[PDB]
Amino acid sequence: PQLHNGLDFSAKVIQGSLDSLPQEVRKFVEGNAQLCQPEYIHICDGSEEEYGRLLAHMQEEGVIRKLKKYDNCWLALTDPRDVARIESKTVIITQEQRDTVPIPKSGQSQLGRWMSEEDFEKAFNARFPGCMKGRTMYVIPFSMGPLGSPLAKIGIELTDSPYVVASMRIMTRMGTSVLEALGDGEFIKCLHSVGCPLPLKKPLVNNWACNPELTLIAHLPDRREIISFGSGYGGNSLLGKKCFALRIASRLAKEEGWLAEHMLILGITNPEGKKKYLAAAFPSACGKTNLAMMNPTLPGWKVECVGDDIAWMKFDAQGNLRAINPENGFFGVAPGTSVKTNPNAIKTIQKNTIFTNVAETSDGGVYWEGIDEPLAPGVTITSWKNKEWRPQDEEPCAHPNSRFCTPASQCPIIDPAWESPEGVPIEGIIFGGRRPAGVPLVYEALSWQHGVFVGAAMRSEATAAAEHKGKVIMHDPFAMRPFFGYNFGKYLAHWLSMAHRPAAKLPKIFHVNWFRKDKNGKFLWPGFGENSRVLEWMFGRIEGEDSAKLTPIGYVPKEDALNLKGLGDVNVEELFGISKEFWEKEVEEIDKYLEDQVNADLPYEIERELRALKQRISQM
Numbered sequence: 249p250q251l252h253n254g255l256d257f258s259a260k261v262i263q264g265s266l267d268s269l270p271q272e273v274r275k276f277v278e279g280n281a282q283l284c285q286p287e288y289i290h291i292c293d294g295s296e297e298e299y300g301r302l303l304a305h306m307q308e309e310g311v312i313r314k315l316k317k318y319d320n321c322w323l324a325l326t327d328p329r330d331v332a333r334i335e336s337k338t339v340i341i342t343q344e345q346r347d348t349v350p351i352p353k354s355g356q357s358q359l360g361r362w363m364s365e366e367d368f369e370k371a372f373n374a375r376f377p378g379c380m381k382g383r384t385m386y387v388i389p390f391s392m393g394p395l396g397s398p399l400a401k402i403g404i405e406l407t408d409s410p411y412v413v414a415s416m417r418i419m420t421r422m423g424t425s426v427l428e429a430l431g432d433g434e435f436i437k438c439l440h441s442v443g444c445p446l447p448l449k450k451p452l453v454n455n456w457a458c459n460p461e462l463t464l465i466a467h468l469p470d471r472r473e474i475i476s477f478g479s480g481y482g483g484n485s486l487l488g489k490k491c492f493a494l495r496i497a498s499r500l501a502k503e504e505g506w507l508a509e510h511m512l513i514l515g516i517t518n519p520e521g522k523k524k525y526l527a528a529a530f531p532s533a534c535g536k537t538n539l540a541m542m543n544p545t546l547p548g549w550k551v552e553c554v555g556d557d558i559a560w561m562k563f564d565a566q567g568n569l570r571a572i573n574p575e576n577g578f579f580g581v582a583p584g585t586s587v588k589t590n591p592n593a594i595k596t597i598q599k600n601t602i603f604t605n606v607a608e609t610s611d612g613g614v615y616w617e618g619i620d621e622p623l624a625p626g627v628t629i630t631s632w633k634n635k636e637w638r639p640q641d642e643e644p645c646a647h648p649n650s651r652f653c654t655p656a657s658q659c660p661i662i663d664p665a666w667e668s669p670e671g672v673p674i675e676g677i678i679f680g681g682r683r684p685a686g687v688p689l690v691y692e693a694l695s696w697q698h699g700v701f702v703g704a705a706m707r708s709e710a711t712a713a714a715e716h717k718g719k720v721i722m723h724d725p726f727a728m729r730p731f732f733g734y735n736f737g738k739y740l741a742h743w744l745s746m747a748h749r750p751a752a753k754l755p756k757i758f759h760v761n762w763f764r765k766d767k768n769g770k771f772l773w774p775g776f777g778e779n780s781r782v783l784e785w786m787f788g789r790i791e792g793e794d795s796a797k798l799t800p801i802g803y804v805p806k807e808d809a810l811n812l813k814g815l816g817d818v819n820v821e822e823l824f825g826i827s828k829e830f831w832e833k834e835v836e837e838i839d840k841y842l843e844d845q846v847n848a849d850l851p852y853e854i855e856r857e858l859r860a861l862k863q864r865i866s867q868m
């Protein structure tokens with residue numbers, strides 16, 4: 249009801265009907281419509297006709313270009329200030345601070361950024377009132393996970409960016425059918441705005457609308473709401489990926505008893521016809537997508553991909569830890585992808601793929617550093633800054649965090665159970681990061697408690713994913729440091745509690761390091777497809793083969809236990825060298841980190857493993 253006509257937005261709907269929306273869905277749409285004041289309201293249906301109209305619209309607006317060399321591939325160049333996640337401006341709103349982060353013993357919490365409701369209300373009222381003036385508010389109904397899976401969650405994202413809508417059609421399952429499955433059930437509320445209401449006060453760079461000064465990515469897990477403003481790039485705008493499927497999902501997983509982790513899922517088959525599934529948690533820009541799509545160099549071995557970034561795991565009635573990929577596509581880093589490193593990715597991104605901030609060749613193709621592919625004579629390269637680029641310049645032709653957005657079903661080695669609603673049984677979990685020194689190539693945990701300690705003690709040199717710089721070894725426990733949704737001490741206690749469940753079939757826990765260098769700064773391990781030799785040893789350990797050797801840090805492969813045939817130049821002494829001087833300093837850094845960041849919320853079982861490791865190292 250109303251006294252005038254200022255609340256009924258039915259006259260602004262250009263596709264769909266507010267009358268056909270569920271009541272709680274319509275309240276969420278009309279409520280924010282009155283606040284953001286959009287010129288139009290577009291209810292997405294996920295059809296090919298709608299996807300084609302948005303591509304044509306963005307091309308006419310100068311947002312995206314058509315890559316004429318491939319089949320339905322598009323290039324988008326963004327503002328140089330809006331190129332990655334902004335971890336510093338990502339906050340979690342809870343009534344009590346201890347719900348979000350463990351109260352630090354002295355320093356500042358590196359495990360999350362908390363903000364009170366009172367402070368966020370002021371930051372919200374200074375950004376969103378009238379932010380969509382003259383723009384179209386798109387309503388995106390999407391489902392994370394197979395539409396029908398028990399662990400499937402439905403979300404509604406409001407946004408004023410057609411680039412977000414197009415990307416969400418690739419990365420999630422979006423359409424009219426998601427609204428039918430929702431009904432009057434619960435959904436996650438997602439609100440996004442680029443923060444450029446018309447008329448524009450500031451001219452846009454590369455026709456990319458963004459507001460870097462007022463960028464804010466807020467999470468309210470008690471309200472099931474995600475509110476993002478100012479950014480339209482990747483993890484900031486695609487609210488169903490990092491904000492939903494990791495931060496909010498980890499909170500829900502703790503409440504409901506499952507797991508939401510920053511892990512890939514791959515299935516590997518041996519020449520004897522046995523197939524196992526593995527999960528691996530690597531930090532951002534550390535090799536997850538390359539591992540999940542690996543072309544193995546060992547004959548008779550095959551790798552199939554279930555997912556490359558996010559995993560939702562939960563025990564079943566039989567005690568098996570089952571995992572699903574809640575995503576629908578791949579949002580992977582472009583630089584470094586070549587026919588040598590990731591040939592299965594090259595086959596995937598040749599059609600129906602949206603590229604962001606990669607270089608364009610004059611014949612209509614893509615180009616980036618590490619592509620390992622020469623060009624034809626007369627072919628010129630246009631950098632991501634929309635400028636002419638020659639190999640003589642200092643700057644790279646593609647941004648380090650440039651991405652491709654391709655459907656998962658196009659991957660030639662996609663696992664036939666990647667859309668199965670029951671999930672795949674995980675028999676192994678892999679941790680690791682970028683360590684240039686000290687950490688051996690691979691080792692195996694001694695128990696479930698030691699394995700949880702291994703994940704909590706993860707460290708890796710700073711990459712180019714967030715906004716950190718410099719060669720600095722930083723802590724990244726479970727590769728979840730920028731994505732924790734609640735107290736990290738309670739996160740560890742949730743992982744340790746898995747060993748208390750009846751009939752539980754706990755997987756083995758391994759730690760790898762593809763990035764160990766020698767004294768020359770050269771990589772000691774070739775990596776990429778050669779990592780199948782490391783996965784071969786894991787496969788045998790899960791079966792129970794006697795190919796392990798006990799060390800002060802865990803189980804390492806025996807002498808002549810790794811298939812190193814063909815790589816006769818590998819320095820096995822330096823690949824598995826365990827220096828006591830290095831590990832005395834390493835445990836000191838882990839002790840100082842866990843004591844300050846977790847403090848009174850640290851489970852005793854984690855402190856016991858820290859004591860045990862330091863004792864075994866002292867006896868060396």
Ligand SMILES: Nc1nc2c(ncn2[C@@H]2O[C@H](COP(=O)(O)OP(=O)(O)OP(=O)(O)O)[C@@H](O)[C@H]2O)c(=O)[nH]1
Binds near residue numbers: 530556557774775
């Ligand atoms: N030396 C070495 N480098 C690798 C290996 N695998 C991947 N890399 C490099 O590490 C970078 C990380 O690539 P990704 O697999 O996309 O990183 P990611 O873990 O998926 O990170 P996100 O996509 O942000 O979640 C790539 O650009 C590769 O160049 C490897 O086995 N050995």
Ligand SMILES: O=C(O)C(=O)CS(=O)(=O)O
Binds near residue numbers: 333482483713
């Ligand atoms: O940061 C990561 O690990 C990503 O996968 C990229 S984004 O989706 O967070 O932009």
Ligand SMILES: [Mn+2]
Binds near residue numbers: 309
């Ligand atoms: Mn126009």
Ligand SMILES: [Mn+2]
Binds near residue numbers: 510532557
């Ligand atoms: Mn990731």
Ligand SMILES: [Mn+2]
Binds near residue numbers: 536537556557579581
């Ligand atoms: Mn990836």
